[PDB]
Amino acid sequence: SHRKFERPRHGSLGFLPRKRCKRLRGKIRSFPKDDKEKPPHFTAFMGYKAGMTHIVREVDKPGSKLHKKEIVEACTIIECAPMVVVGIVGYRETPKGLRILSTVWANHVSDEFRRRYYKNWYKSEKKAFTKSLNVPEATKNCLLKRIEKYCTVLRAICHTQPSKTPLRMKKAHIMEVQINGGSMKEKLEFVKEMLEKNLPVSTVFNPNEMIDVISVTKGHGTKGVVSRYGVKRLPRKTHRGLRKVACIGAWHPARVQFQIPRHGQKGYFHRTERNKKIYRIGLKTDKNSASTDADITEKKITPMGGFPHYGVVNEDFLLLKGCVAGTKKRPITLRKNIVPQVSRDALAQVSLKFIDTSSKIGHGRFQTSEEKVKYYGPLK
């Protein structure tokens, strides 16, 4: 018989299996689509989540209850070392999907790039990319010509520069980035000219843009159904347990109907967060990088005592509105929206009033060490 009282099912069926991701690096499912009128440009970037801060922002929001008045908001900080392009990928459309024709490489590569292939860099003779050290420039040109002629999608093989970071890892993350815009020839000219250079996030993105965020979630191992799916807890009276499972269900199917909640992995899942606004694209050489029109005071983005488990910011950085999937220290993938967002909020231009640089370890009030010293005074 039917249930007496109705009540929505626990959790989404559409994110079965609730299992571990097979890569640390975020995986872009799909890229931005055709726009021949637009000039060629990069679609994506990897950067590392350093932590969270809060902001004070002045609000326009027409007809709002808050309206004109200022708001305080949480924000994420992502240190972004410039990615380096090392390869060109030429893909061609088939009724079996996109297929690679060939890849064309740069005329030298990083040690950090080579480290990703080696499992035992320390105990090896490091012979990778040494027959493929060089070939005739004619061969390269022929491959480029071939790709222009036959390929219909261009991706650039890019890689991270972890040597510009405090992290334990020295292996680069290597990555394809689709190039979206004009003709394949115009694109090819664009990637070739760009190639060996380093790409700041400011070269890829503009402040105020809405951005799509691709990351693996924070782990937790294998967890019970209550934790995993949020079902109503067992009664005070039971034969056994309280985080112990409900009924599985009907005699027909004469099998477990798969839609039932179950114990198993929780977190370390791949996930796309959508439409996060860029509040500031920071500059490495700016010593005023946390300051605002209201503040106008020399002051770097780095918190008091730095970010938890990451410390100082020493490269360029993205100040992003709101939450981001995964642990601090994790690589995070930024992608442009597949169709550009059109909204009030998308169009809008942020005016910060304050960026916090207080401690995130304890309740350390001070923006600067100098302020802390100034408060306390003489010491022994």
């Binding site: 809060h54 305080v72 304050f354 916090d356 207080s358 309740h363 408060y375």
Partner: protein, 62 residues
């Protein structure tokens, strides 16, 4: 221009960190910490608080 002062200490009030209590008397009390909040809850006067800057001032040690 820049944010208001703590008054339980010399400190500026940095946002988010502070909470606000409105008493039956119509009096607001602004707290910069849980530790400050607990002291207020236990209703213990400043003149017993050896750690705090107000005490140091009260005993003229500034």
């Amino acid at each position: 221009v820049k944010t208001e002062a703590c008054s339980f200490s010399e400190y500026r009030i940095y946002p988010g960190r502070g909470q606000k209590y409105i008493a039956r008397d119509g009096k607001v009390y602004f707290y910069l910490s849980s530790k400050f909040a607990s002291l207020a809850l236990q209703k213990k006067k400043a003149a017993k608080l050896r750690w705090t800057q107000t005490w140091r001032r009260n005993n003229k040690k500034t």
